[PDB]
């Protein structure tokens, strides 16, 4: 094998300089043999299993050698060493390049000038670079570009040696040894000769290879060329950093492949990180600044990251090139979904505008947040700066002092600062980015965990002391309290006792009580309830104080609720709207807490049932009161179910719970038909939850005691739930605004999920899912993921009934078509086309990897056939059966039947097919013939 | 034929490069914003198929209750 040099450079595990020296030794003796082996090395590096012979080298031209090597390539595939995956080939690329460079640099004082080695190598590489064989062109271009950068290093060494020789010549002249001056001039002449030869070789490779291969059809080759021209401009700036070499990067940063724009930006970075302040570079940047700024939004995120980083380096260079509009465009990217871009923009912003002491920095961040009409909250702004401005962001003492102590601060700015502070505290306690910015999940470093604990304790201390003050100051603003009340949920609660801080805990509870009895906003009450839940941890010594305050607040609220309902529901008094608002505020405060707390000791089922049954019997009951009473009764029932676990619960207690739930279900069924949309929605959601909790699965996990509590919905109730889904989830399209539509779509998606949970957990007949499955392509972009999870779980449950329900869906679509169009409908229309497309996508949900599929698919055909021949023509046997067209849909499933099953399906089709039909081959009968041919 | 890769066209002509300089509109895009509001962020967290099918339609702020619902899954 002539694979010596190739194999060595591939897996030699040997310093390239030793191999290069060995080759130069082979050269010194027999130059031609060494050069032939070098040629064959390049050829084999291109994956060529061919071999150039001595006779060829002697008597053949480059074109002929290339043609013969192409013919004798003897390839097994389209692969060549530079497109192979794996480390054993990336190392090959590295070794190839290192070898080229070391060869050149080691020949640079003698062999490089013999006018033999380099001309040969450059001719060969040029030829291979102008070949249509991609392996040859790719390889030869890489080789030639590495060779050129080595030549550049050589020419730079020569320029240095010439400067030093000129210095010595000047020195010796100043001395006046005339002989030594003449000798120095002769050395100057020799060095200029060498400079000229090196320039010739560099110009050769540049003109014969680069100017063509930088624009190669293959993007990878363009990338090679741009990477290396960047290297040249970086390493010999004095020679290669001019327009004559920068226009190439200018043009290529418009390439249509991100692989190439990336290399352009990285080359320009490498030129700007020198911080040598070039003027040629400044004018090039002036010319292509708009292009770079636009690339901050490149379709490839990597490219945008690098464009931002290049703009940062440009700032460092000079803050005079970029206009305000440019910098604002870069700022807007901190709110981007992709984190790399967001932190690049965050570094840009920090360096441009953010460069105790950290006071006015906070004011500037708040002004920026408010000037940014792109995000109403601050989680993502915070996360963008987390890397470059951790100090400023964790300086919570400065934030609290700004909010409390005392132009000053506005209300907008106080709200914004509260928001930013809450975000920083959340990302400090929680050591992960907000959703959509998190790069998966990982284990925190020891340092990260210690920082987590330190930050957690700082927060606990500071805000255990300050939050009562903040609450008091902004007790009346709803956003501010809603946010501030989320702070205790990150505390280390033990510090309340180990820190002698119970006084501030009492102050906080009192501020919370004042906020509750003073507010009605649902978010405020949500925060109050969840924070009270957070503080009442049974594994902390402060449990009893907070439990006492909680019980007192519940006592007050329940007393006021009973007293308000004693007058609101009096058959005489016709309540006003303000009496209703009072009752509603009390009920809201009660419900928010009954969700996250066990108020079974207050037996609020009575009041809520009375409210709901009054609403039913009278038909006039404010919506909000109705929905909150529904929620509160839901929570009462769930909490009682929670307390039933222990066998210490009485039998009469379980009977009480069962009857309460049984009547609550009828109440929710009554409200499901209400005229108010949101009331119907609330009833539906609570019904779906109750039906899941009380499904047979209630007794699954050794919970046999729970056998009597199982609740199965009526057929009427099943149909009512499905009808609500059909009327509310599946609505028209188009082809407020963004906010209203996304809100509505998320609400309806949760509804559909609530019903599909009942389906996939067999709480309702699987057949109902047909009405949903049929809506999979028409509502794909909205509900398709949910519908598809439903299909998957139903298949995994009972593939056979899944297929039966699928064919029922297609049958419903078919009956609906014939209803709207008619029994003489056109089979070339868009409706029938769409139905058979849905049938195709349905068919691809099978596969014989699971044997059961066979029977399943078989059933799908049986039923199918039975539906196509169900209703006959009013004329009789001489006219097609009404649902005959359905067969043309069923054929989309023949691609999943097996050779054995096709015959059985055919025999079952003969049970319905007659001879007079089998012969019929006119137009209207073509669906049957097609379905037959499929089998 | 041969599994060897042979490009028929090796270069992009000059006119297509002038075209690339004139119009890069197809290699840039709009700012893909992150959830702009708190609600939309919560919904991004809890609005997928897995979460939706593994959580109750009426949220339960106490695990003591949410377990009553999650019990009935498989």
């Amino acid at each position: 094998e002539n694979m010596m040099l190739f194999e060595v450079v591939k897996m030699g595990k040997s310093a390239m300089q030793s191999v290069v020296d060995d080759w130069i030794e082979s050269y010194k003796h027999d130059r031609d043999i060494a050069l032939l082996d070098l040629i064959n090395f390049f050829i084999q590096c291109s994956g060529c299993k061919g071999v150039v012979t001595a006779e060829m080298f002697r008597h053949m031209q480059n074109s002929e050698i290339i043609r013969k090597m192409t013919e004798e390539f003897d390839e097994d595939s389209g692969d060549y060493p530079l497109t192979m995956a794996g480390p054993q080939w990336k190392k090959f690329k590295s070794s190839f390049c290192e070898f080229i460079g070391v060869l050149v640099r080691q020949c640079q004082y003698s062999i490089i000038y013999d006018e033999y080695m380099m001309d040969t190598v450059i001719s060969l590489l040029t030829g291979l670079s102008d070949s249509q064989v991609r392996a040859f062109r790719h390889t030869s271009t890489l080789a030639a570009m590495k060779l050129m950068t080595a030549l550049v290093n050589v020419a730079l060494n020569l320029s240095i040696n010439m400067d030093n020789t000129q210095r010595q010549y000047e020195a010796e002249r100043n001395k006046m040894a005339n002989e030594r001056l003449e000798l120095l001039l002769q050395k100057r002449k020799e060095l200029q000769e060498n400079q000229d030869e090196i320039e010739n070789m560099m110009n050769a490779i540049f003109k014969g290879v680069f100017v063509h291969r930088y624009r190669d059809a293959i993007a990878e080759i363009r990338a090679i060329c741009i990477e290396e021209i960047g290297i040249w401009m970086k390493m010999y700036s004095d020679a290669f950093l001019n327009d004559s070499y920068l226009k190439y990067v200018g043009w290529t940063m418009h390439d249509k492949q991100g692989e190439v724009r990336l290399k352009c930006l990285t080359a320009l970075q490498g030129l700007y990180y020198n911080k040598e302040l070039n003027s040629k570079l400044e004018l090039f940047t002036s010319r292509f600044k708009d292009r770079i700024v636009s690339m901050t939004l490149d379709k490839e995120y990597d490219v945008a990251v690098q464009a931002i980083k290049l703009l940062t380096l440009v700032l460092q260079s000079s803050e005079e090139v970029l206009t305000a509009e440019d910098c604002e465009n870069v700022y807007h990217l901190v709110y981007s979904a992709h984190r790399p871009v967001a932190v690049a923009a965050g570094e840009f912003l920090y360096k441009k505008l953010f460069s105790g002491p950290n006071a006015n920095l906070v004011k500037t961040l708040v002004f920026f947040f408010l000037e940014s009409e792109l995000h109403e909250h601050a989680a993502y702004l915070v996360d963008s700066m987390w890397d470059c401005a951790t100090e400023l962001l964790k300086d919570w003492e400065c934030m609290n002092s700004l909010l409390l102590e005392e132009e000053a601060l506005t209300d907008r700015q106080e709200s914004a600062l509260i928001e930013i502070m809450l975000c920083t505290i959340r990302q400090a306690a929680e050591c992960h980015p907000p959703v959509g910015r998190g790069t998966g999940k990982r284990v925190l470093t020891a340092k990260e965990k210690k920082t987590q604990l330190d930050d957690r304790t700082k927060i606990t201390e500071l805000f255990a002391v300050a939050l009562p003050q903040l609450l008091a100051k902004y007790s009346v603003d709803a956003e501010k309290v809603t946010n501030l009340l989320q702070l205790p949920q990150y505390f280390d609660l033990e510090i309340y006792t180990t820190g002698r801080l119970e006084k501030h805990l009492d102050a906080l509870l009192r501020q919370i009580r004042n906020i509750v009895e003073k507010h009605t906003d649902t978010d405020v009450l949500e925060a109050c309830s969840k924070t009270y839940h957070a503080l009442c941890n049974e594994e902390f010594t402060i449990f009893n104080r907070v439990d006492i305050s909680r019980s007192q607040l519940i006592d007050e609220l329940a007393d006021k609720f009973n007293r308000l309902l004693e007058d609101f529901l009096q058959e005489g008094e016709e309540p006003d709207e303000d009496d209703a608002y009072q009752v509603l505020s009390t009920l809201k405060r009660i419900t928010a807490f009954h969700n996250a707390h066990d108020l079974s000791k207050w037996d609020l089922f009575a009041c809520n049932y009375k409210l709901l049954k009054t609403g039913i019997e009278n038909g006039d009951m404010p919506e909000q009161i109705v929905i909150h009473a529904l929620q509160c009764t839901h929570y009462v029932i769930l909490w009682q179910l929670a307390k039933i676990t222990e066998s210490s619960s009485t039998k009469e207690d379980l009977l009480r719970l069962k009857k309460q739930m049984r009547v609550f279900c009828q109440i929710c069924q009554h409200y499901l038909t209400n005229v108010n949309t949101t009331v119907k929605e609330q009833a539906f959601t609570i019904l779906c939850d109750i039906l899941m909790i009380f499904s047979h699965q209630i007794m699954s996990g050794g919970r046999d005691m729970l056998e009597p509590l199982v609740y199965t919905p009526d057929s009427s109730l099943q149909s009512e739930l499905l009808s609500f889904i059909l009327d509310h989830v599946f609505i028209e399209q188009d082809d407020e605004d963004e906010a209203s539509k996304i809100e509505a779509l998320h609400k309806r998606r949760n509804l559909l999920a609530a019903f599909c949970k009942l389906i996939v957990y067999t709480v309702v007949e699987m057949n109902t899912a047909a009405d949903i499955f049929k809506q999979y392509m028409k509502y794909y972009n909205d509900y398709g993921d949910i519908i598809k999870e439903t299909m998957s779980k139903t298949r995994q449950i009972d593939k056979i009934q899944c297929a039966k329900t699928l064919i029922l869906s297609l049958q419903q679509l078919f009956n609906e078509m014939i209803q709207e169009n008619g029994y003489n409908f056109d089979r070339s229309s868009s409706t029938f086309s769409g139905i058979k497309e849905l049938a195709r996508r349905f068919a691809l949900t099978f596969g014989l990897d699971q044997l059961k599929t066979r029977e399943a698919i078989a059933m799908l055909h049986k039923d199918g056939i039975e539906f196509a021949f169900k209703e006959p023509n009013p004329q009789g046997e001489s006219h097609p059966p009404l649902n005959l067209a359905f067969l043309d849909i069923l054929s989309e499933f023949s691609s999943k039947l097996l050779r054995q099953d096709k015959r059985t399906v055919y025999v079952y089709l003969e049970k319905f097919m007659t001879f007079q039909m089998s012969l019929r081959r006119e137009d209207v009968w073509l669906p049957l013939m097609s379905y037959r041919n499929s089998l | 034929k041969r599994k060897l890769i042979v490009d028929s066209v090796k270069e992009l002509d000059s006119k297509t490069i002038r075209a690339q300089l004139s119009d890069y509109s197809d290699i840039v895009t709009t700012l893909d914003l992150a959830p702009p509001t708190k609600k939309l962020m919560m919904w991004k967290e809890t609005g997928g198929v897995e979460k939706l099918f593994s959580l109750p339609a009426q949220p339960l702020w106490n695990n003591r209750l949410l377990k009553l619902f999650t019990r009935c899954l498989t």
Binding site: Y335, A337, L374, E738, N781, G784, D785 | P35, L40
Partner: peptide, 13 residues
């Protein structure tokens, strides 16, 4: 302009 892809479920195909 700027846009939020609110439909993080139609993302797939």
């Amino acid at each position: 302009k700027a846009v939020y892809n609110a439909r993080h479920w139609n993302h797939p195909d």
